[PDB]
Amino acid sequence: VVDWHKHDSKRMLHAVYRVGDLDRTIKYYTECFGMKLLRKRDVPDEKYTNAFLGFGPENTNFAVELTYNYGVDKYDIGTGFGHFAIANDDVYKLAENIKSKGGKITREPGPVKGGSTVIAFAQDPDGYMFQLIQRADTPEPLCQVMLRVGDLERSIKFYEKALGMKLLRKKDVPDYKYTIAMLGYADEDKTTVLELTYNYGVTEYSKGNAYAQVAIGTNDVYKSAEAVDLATKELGGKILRQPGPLPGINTKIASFVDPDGWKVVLVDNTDFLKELH
Ligand SMILES: N[C@@H](CCC(=O)N[C@@H](CS)C(=O)NCC(=O)O)C(=O)O
Ligand SMILES: [Co+2]
């Protein structure tokens, strides 16, 4: 009866991570990457400011949630965090826009080494990598969060059983000693996937203190947390916050780490809508 996965309607909501200079990142994402600034919220009582950016409204699209901590101008990215990706129908056009705007292209546009898909890489002001992926027409340009993991097979099993993700793609690249998987809730080219990368013989990475978590919406945080609890008893990872409403707000969430220590927050799909204004 973990056929709850089949009855839920989960959705990748946003990646949350920290930035040294909020205005600098906003300007880089709007001007270099063509994102929209969706919402900005200042929180003096707790000493931070958030900004939310993406390619459509947060009720239908995935977003980045940026956290600026007062008087903190840098973070450790760590070695485990891979990249965010942006799909675009002309990666040459986009890369040259980024260069024009004074952005950093670290990997010029061209087919992936060993494959055919045209990709490029940009580096943002804090050091976060953005892959650019040539793709004809997606409803979701902000289309990957890539994380490194120590055991690809353990992680695939974990995301399937804990989160109801489908394994969309698994690809071994022995010439370059890595293997990838993409997991998510719809066809890869229509959605935001989680891309997990294993490098041969590498079992550990630093989580840093820059990337915080990914948030995933669910029709019921209690049912979905039960599935997480079962998966963690078998496969590794740990519940952080048990399912329930947050103090005062009544917004229902649960949170956990995966077998490698990456954090995921489950948020009630309807409660999530309560801040999107
Ligand atoms: N060691 C790499 C392995 C993954 C990898 O190389 N992925 C491809 C895309 S699937 C890439 O970045 N290739 C570099 C290129 O084509 O220049 C990592 O951990 O990031
Ligand atoms: Co990627």
For the chain, what is the HEC assignment? CCCHHHHCCCEEEEEEEECCCHHHHHHHHHHCCCCEEEEEEEEHHHCEEEEEEECCCCCCCCEEEEEEECCCCCCCCCCCEEEEEEEECCHHHHHHHHHHCCCEEEEEEEECCCCCCEEEEEECCCCCEEEEEECCCCCCCEEEEEEECCCHHHHHHHHHHHHCCEEEEEEEEHHHCEEEEEEECCCHHHCCEEEEEEECCCCCCCCCCCEEEEEEEECCHHHHHHHHHHHHHHHCCEEEEEEEECCCCCCEEEEEECCCCCEEEEEEHHHHHCCCC
Looking at domain 1-137, its CATH class is alpha beta
The technique is X-ray
Closest listed ligand to the CA of 84 = 2
Closest C-alpha among 108, 78, 80, 77 to residue 199: 80
Q: What is the resolution of this structure in A?
A: 1.5
What's the one-letter identity of residue 232? T
What distance in Å separates the CA atoms of residue 220 and residue 163, rounded to the nearest whole number?
12
CA 31 from chain centre, in angstroms, equals 21
Domain ranges of the chain: 1-137, 138-277
> Dihedral through CA 75, CA 77, CA 78, CA 83, nearest 10?
170
Task: Classify residue 34 as left (phi > 0), alpha (psi -120 to 50) or beta.
Answer: left
Closest C-alpha among 84, 107, 89, 110 to residue 28: 84
Q: Which CATH architecture describes the domain 138-277?
A: Roll (3.10)
For the CA of 146, the closest atom of ligand 1 is 20
Closest C-alpha among 212, 228, 81 to residue 149: 81
Q: Which residues surround ligand 2, an ion (CB under 5 A)?
A: 85, 131, 144, 146, 195
For the CA of 148, the closest atom of ligand 1 is 19
